[PDB]
A and B are shown apart, each in its own frame.
Chain A
Amino acid sequence: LKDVNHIHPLPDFVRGGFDYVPSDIFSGKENFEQTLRILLERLEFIDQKMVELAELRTTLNAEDAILDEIGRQLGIYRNGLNDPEYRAVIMILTGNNSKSGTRADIIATLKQLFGEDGVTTYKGYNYRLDINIFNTCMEVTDILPEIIDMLPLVTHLRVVENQGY
């Protein structure tokens, strides 16, 4: 019924405070109101930017100019990656820390990179595993090094990518 995240722009900030004019003594004088409005409306701008200072620092929306700072703390350097996929690698490596490389587990990680039906996985008798891609939205060669990391120590892997079925 209520949002748990209380960090939001204050609703109707301006009309508040004006509500504290005692008994409409000054209201309708058009000389005191403008003086008060001019000062209060400055806080509006500062109040608004208080959110982006917290909202924009999250990894989901962080821009490349500062996303590097988030990656730097985790040891994931930009190298030659671009912004749209640099976000992906950060997620992939971080998610690897609570993984076991099971068949059900592997499907889950690939799920975040190719939608619901964009990926499928065949399995083979002698350590063979196969990955199929149908709806890639980013160039895969630069993402490939991580795709190896979350697999068992002895996996034998093939990678094939195509658009659609």
Chain B
Amino acid sequence: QFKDLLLDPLTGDLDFGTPGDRGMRLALTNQLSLRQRLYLRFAIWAGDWYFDETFGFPYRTFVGKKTVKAVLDGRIKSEVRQEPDVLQITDFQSTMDVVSRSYKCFFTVVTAEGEEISLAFVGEDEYQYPTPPESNVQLCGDEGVIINFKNKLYYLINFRLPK
């Protein structure tokens, strides 16, 4: 439920929205929040962000060196579980090509969805305060009491005659 500015999954810029409803949006669904929380966590190289030297991933250790596939998978699979709301990891297809020296892995992560605790900070309210009456209706009655009775009588006259 971690709120934050929404990042476009397709381009990487802020998700200002479609041309018909351009604006700014907050990440509300846990899925969207977790997506960008993993994306930033994996995209920032370790130590390259000032104000926090411990954040990021240490790509320099592996890239450019002769490395064992098994060691890399452990670190990749470990960084994911640093988020407190990750249920499990389903599958992991780690493959390496020696000709091009490229490495490419696949996997998915499962996360549940929570409640909103309070709507005070977001948009709307859930209550249905009453509406003041109109004109002399309060002190003298209402005509609808006649209309509903007339309709009931008419529908009952309709019911008895077979159709």
Return B129 CB to nearest CB of chain A, in Å.
39
Count of residues in B whose CB is under 8 Å from the partner chain:
14
State in angstroms the CA–CA spacing of A26 and B50 once bound together: 16
Interface string of A123-140 (1 = CB under 8 A from B): 000000000000000000
B13 engages A20 (CB within 8 Å)? no
B44 engages A23 (CB within 8 Å)? yes
Return A100 CB to nearest CB of chain B, in Å.
60
Return B107 CB to nearest CB of chain A, in Å.
21
Interface string of A82-119 (1 = CB under 8 A from B): 00000000000000000000000000000000000000
Q: Does A25 contact B (CB under 8 A)?
A: yes
Q: Does A11 contact B (CB under 8 A)?
A: no
| Chain B residues closer than 8 Å to A32, beta-carbon distance | 13-14
A31 engages B43 (CB within 8 Å)? no
Partner of B14 from A20, A22, A31 at Cβ < 8 Å: A31
Q: Does B2 contact A (CB under 8 A)?
A: no
Return A130 CB to nearest CB of chain B, in Å.
71
| Chain B residues closer than 8 Å to A30, beta-carbon distance | 13
A29-B11, A31-B11 in contact; A23/B16 too (CB < 8 A)? Answer: no
B43 engages A25 (CB within 8 Å)? yes
Count of residues in A whose CB is under 8 Å from the partner chain:
10
Chain A residues 1 to 39 lying within 8 A of chain B, measured CB to CB, are 20, 22-23, 25-26, 29-32, 35
Chain B residues 26 to 49 lying within 8 A of chain A, measured CB to CB, are 40, 43-45, 48-49
| Chain A residues closer than 8 Å to B45, beta-carbon distance | 22-23
State in angstroms the CA–CA spacing of A23 and B50 once bound together: 11
State in angstroms the CA–CA spacing of A105 and B49 once bound together: 63
Q: Which residue of A lies closest to B39 (CB)?
A: A25
A23 engages B48 (CB within 8 Å)? yes
| Chain B residues closer than 8 Å to A23, beta-carbon distance | 43-45, 48-49, 56
Q: Which residue of A lies closest to B14 (CB)?
A: A31
| Chain A residues closer than 8 Å to B16, beta-carbon distance | 31
State in angstroms the CA–CA spacing of A35 and B44 once bound together: 21
| Chain B residues closer than 8 Å to A31, beta-carbon distance | 8, 11, 13-14, 16
Q: Does B12 contact A (CB under 8 A)?
A: yes
State in angstroms the CA–CA spacing of A23 and B43 once bound together: 8
Return B158 CB to nearest CB of chain A, in Å.
63
Residues of chain B having any CB pair with chain A under 8 Å = 8, 11-14, 16, 40, 43-45, 48-50, 56
Add 20 more A-B contacts to A25-B40, A26-B12, A29-B12 (CB < 8 A). A20-B50, A22-B44, A22-B48, A22-B49, A23-B43, A23-B44, A23-B45, A23-B49, A23-B56, A25-B12, A25-B43, A26-B13, A29-B11, A30-B13, A31-B8, A31-B11, A31-B14, A31-B16, A32-B14, A35-B14
Q: Shortest 6 CB-CB distances between A and B: which pairs?
A: A31-B13, A29-B13, A22-B49, A22-B44, A25-B43, A23-B48
Could you list some 20 contacts between A and B, CB below 8 A? A20-B50, A22-B45, A22-B48, A22-B56, A23-B43, A23-B45, A23-B49, A23-B56, A25-B40, A25-B43, A26-B13, A29-B12, A29-B13, A30-B13, A31-B8, A31-B11, A31-B14, A31-B16, A32-B13, A35-B14
